Amino acid sequence: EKFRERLKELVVPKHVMDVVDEELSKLGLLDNHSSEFNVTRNYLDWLTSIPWGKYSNENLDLARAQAVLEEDHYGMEDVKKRILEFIAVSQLRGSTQGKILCFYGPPGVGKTSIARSIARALNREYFRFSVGGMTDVAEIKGHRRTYVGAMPGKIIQCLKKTKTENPLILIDEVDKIGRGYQGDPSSALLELLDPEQNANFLDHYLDVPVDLSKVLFICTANVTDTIPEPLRDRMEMINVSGYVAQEKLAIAERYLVPQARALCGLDESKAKLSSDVLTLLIKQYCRESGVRNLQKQVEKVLRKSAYKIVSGEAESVEVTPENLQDFVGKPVFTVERMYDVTPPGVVMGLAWTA
Amino acid sequence: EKFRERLKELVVPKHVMDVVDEELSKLGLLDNHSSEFNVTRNYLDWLTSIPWGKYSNENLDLARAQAVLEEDHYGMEDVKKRILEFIAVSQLRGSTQGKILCFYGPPGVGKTSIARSIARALNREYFRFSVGGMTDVAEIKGHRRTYVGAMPGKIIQCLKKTKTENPLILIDEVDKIGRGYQGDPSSALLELLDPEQNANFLDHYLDVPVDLSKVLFICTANVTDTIPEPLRDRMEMINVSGYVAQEKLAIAERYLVPQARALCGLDESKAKLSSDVLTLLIKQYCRESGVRNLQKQVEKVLRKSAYKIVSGEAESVEVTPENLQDFVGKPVFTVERMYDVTPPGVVMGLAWTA
Amino acid sequence: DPSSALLELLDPEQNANFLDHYLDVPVDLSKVLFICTANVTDTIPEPLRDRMEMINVSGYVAQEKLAIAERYLVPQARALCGLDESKAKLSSDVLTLLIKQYCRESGVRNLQKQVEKVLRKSAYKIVSGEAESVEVTPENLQDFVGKPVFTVERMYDVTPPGVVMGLAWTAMGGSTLFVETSLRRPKDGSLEVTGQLGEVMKESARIAYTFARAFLMQHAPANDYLVTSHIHLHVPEGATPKDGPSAGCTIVTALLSLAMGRPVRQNLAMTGEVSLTGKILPVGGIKEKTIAAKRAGVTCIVLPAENKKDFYDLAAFITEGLEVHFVEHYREIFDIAFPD
Amino acid sequence: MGGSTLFVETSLRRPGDKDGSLEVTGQLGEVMKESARIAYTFARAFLMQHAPANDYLVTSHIHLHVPEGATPKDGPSAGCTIVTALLSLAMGRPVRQNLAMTGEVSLTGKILPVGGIKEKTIAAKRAGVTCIVLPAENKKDFYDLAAFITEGLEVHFVEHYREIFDIAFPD
Ligand SMILES: Nc1ncnc2c1ncn2[C@@H]1O[C@H](COP(=O)(O)OP(=O)(O)O)[C@@H](O)[C@H]1O
Ligand SMILES: Nc1ncnc2c1ncn2[C@@H]1O[C@H](COP(=O)(O)OP(=O)(O)O)[C@@H](O)[C@H]1O
């Protein structure tokens, strides 16, 4: 009775009901202390827990969505323009729609963080899973229902936790695929990337197909060539470039420093990081195009500041450039370029890597 | 009883009658709670899920077949001729028939798209599965009922979904079949694509053979050299080549642009793309033999036009060559060839790749 | 793997309501602390890596091993073996010799096995009546433990011309490599390189050969050694493979020492990748290279100037007796190696 | 299979400033091939100081081979026996009979320790040799063996090849 009630609100397709109806009869004829009774109970619990016909209420206003995106991140105009165009398309259609987008760029630039901001702007539910060097295809679609202690696929597990059929799905490192031999999960991604095959998605644990359309898919990478040709085909390549030194300071002053201060339990009245000391961190303690390394250095400075105030060394820590060496040590990088005055036969060039 | 009416509608062979009758008596003498019950009912369910002697009402009208094929695709005379000849032969036969066809050509040319159109023209159920990067044989054939979590082959699942014995099964990426260190899966494909052995296709899970004749098998490939000789020898090779710039304009004007407008949700009077814009897009923004990259550019132009309409910048959007850069940016391929004039020692040549 | 089953344990949302399969009622795991451990950072779960704060636990040089064994390992091993301090006595000097010659790994478990073996052998002597009290000396340690694993640390006590000490990184700690050059023959010169040198280190020899040859032109124009003579270069570890550009400056010194016939300073070890112009570039693994220098008993160590942070990121006793020299160009190294 | 003895045999391939060359045959490994080159370079240098008049190892072309042709071989343990073989051929003087030597040799001339001392020592007695030459760093390994594997063997422990030369060529 309880499981029948929990399906009342959902909009279940006909093929879902017959599977549920037939398993209910099997559950009725079983016994309480039967091992397969638990398997039937576990399987039937998953089917009802998955939302059917339930779509989260989207946000279809350009003004508020643009404002939300601007506050969360700095720059990323190429990504922001695409998201604004995504919302406008949904208004003309009159119904929610899904797209497959790709964010490729240097690591730590903001590819993963921007997608979280996208979900809140669209009022969707955020779920993240990584495919860096995948080896088992069972991650995507789970195990077969007959296997003891089997579980549904991670995508199916996403609908249970998100409790809606319109989530935002994030994929990490599509350029770091794992060429498995005993199992190749690249086929599952190609099925998911194909819009025609995306509409009808089937898993091992749940024989019934599930509609994965109208779902906004984000995949992240560093360099596009390693991505397989069938995978680059179905991805909209949105490019996320690196940051210059002055751009990093704006990100650090407005986003990195206030966030790291919050995760350390401090407020702006106790620990203060000057603008010049952040410049010294960027130009000497950082060389990557992203801000991942800079974020760790800011976190480490706040960790030492928190210890100092509690342990009685001070009551308010101010990180001047003079005493920065106490918090982080000697500069990691002291020369911006190997040659300052190139001798004859030496010419500076440019490179581009992952 | 439930399995009985499922076979009452179909026309079942004598040997299938023998297996189902002996297995039906086995269920009656079996224990409901035993693990053998799950294996027996699952296999017997698959027997009842095979549409024995069930055929879709094929479309033998040559006039409508030409209309359906022409109204969904442009050019491809070689493929269109083959389908018309297939229908003409079926009229003389008085019964349905099956063939093994292979479409090979540059990617993004219409090999998969026309396959769906052919099924609509012939009133046949459409099923697609890929063999690209495939290493395990069992997916084609299946596994014995002894093994836990053993499912039938893909072909058996095709009959259950379509509920007919004359589908249009599309096998994609036959030229990129994965080499098997433990066993080549193309060896099992030969039994699938052998006209002599199609009449009796025996798989591991389903002990009874299945008449796989009267099934239109269509295979998709990019280059015919990599396809194994035994597989290539049993198939018919039809070349679907790329289009010239003049043909690309006709495809975009009639098919790509109207389809992208429906996807974005724009009326003709709202967003317009003149032939001059499309000619520029083909010549300078897409260096390809197919119309795949052109499709992405067309979607990009219409997607940006929808944003302008919602934002109120322009009530109706008209795309012209002078303001084309506002939608797609600077041209990509600004030069038709490296040397307008060839200095001594430099000779122009021609190349042909995949 | 059941990594998903561990996600709920480390997910704050699922900690409040821990839905146990056995127990229907949830339990509160929010007020619970979790600590994790790992060994190698390549097979760690990258999807789960973001949740946990990566903390590196470095090993121990022989100084901490003596302190750890004296305070923790020996008293604990003696307690398990049932011995007493008055019966079996392990002095500080023998423990240092045991660590130096038998346990050079960065871990501690191997040191536990050796001390238990000594105590186990000592227990046999007491029970059998061989001796009322068992005492361990450096000469007796071979009988109790067994085979020394590391006997000699300096292949050359005095380096002849053409031989320069270098520093290397190994899994079992540091190692000192020598670079030897000699005349293969009594026109174009050539350099044959032997030893199990990798592609990266073989290229560095070619770069070092070019710079060393060019260095002599601006230093001693009348010296036509490296331009006309055939040189054989070898790193005297035939079996063990060697790679990395860390020996670039060592090769230049060896080539110049052979050309001028002047031996290098007898207690000098140098490290650093050299460029075509002659600029010293930073080299990793400074901690392992510098401790091996102390074991080899060298006084002055030459390092690239870009490695100043790494050298000063070490304990006081590690870099106590070393007169480190930081250089940016090889011209500084040449003066240090050839003071006259 | 309890170790075995090997021989290093060299002979002249051919009867103004052109130099000689060394060709090595036998299924030698990469490490053993490098050891031959190191030994060849040291043998040239050693003969210069010992006998400047001799010009055998500089101009003549020498072929080096290990008679177990079909058996793969590897390791630098044959460094000293290759040097002795080259010097014996150059001087035209056979080495002292019933003498077996092993040990890695650097081009400077120092003898380095080698593994498998137990197997080499057992094979030395099986061939009924009188004197065995080992690196000085292997002194502990030799005396760690059982008592019955040592008697009847006059072992010489060396750290530089110049000690092997006196032993192999007493005069
Ligand atoms: N433009 C930006 N505005 C605000 N925060 C940023 C910006 N760029 C980067 N960050 C911060 O830096 C971090 C980048 O890490 P992440 O983007 O997850 O790495 P990756 O790019 O490899 O996915 C994020 O936690 C984010 O908070
Ligand atoms: N001649 C044509 N007429 C109309 N549309 C076409 C034509 N050729 C290609 N297209 C369109 O271009 C796209 C090309 O994709 P397709 O070639 O089917 O992929 P694949 O190469 O994997 O088979 C199709 O979606 C199809 O709608």
Numbering used by the authors:
A (entry chain E), B (entry chain D): 419 to 772
C (entry chain F): 602 to 787, 796 to 949
D (entry chain A): 773 to 787, 794 to 949
From the paper:
The hexameric, barrel-forming, AAA+ protease Lon is critical for maintaining mitochondrial matrix protein homeostasis. A human Lon monomer contains a mitochondrial targeting sequence, a Lon-associated N-terminal (LAN) domain, an α-helical neck region, an AAA+ domain, and a protease domain (PD) in a single chain. The LAN domains specifically recognize and capture fully or partially unfolded substrates, which are then threaded towards the barrel chamber for degradation using the chemical energy from ATP hydrolysis. We determined high-resolution structures of substrate-engaged, substrate-trapped, and substrate-free forms of the human mitochondrial Lon protease.
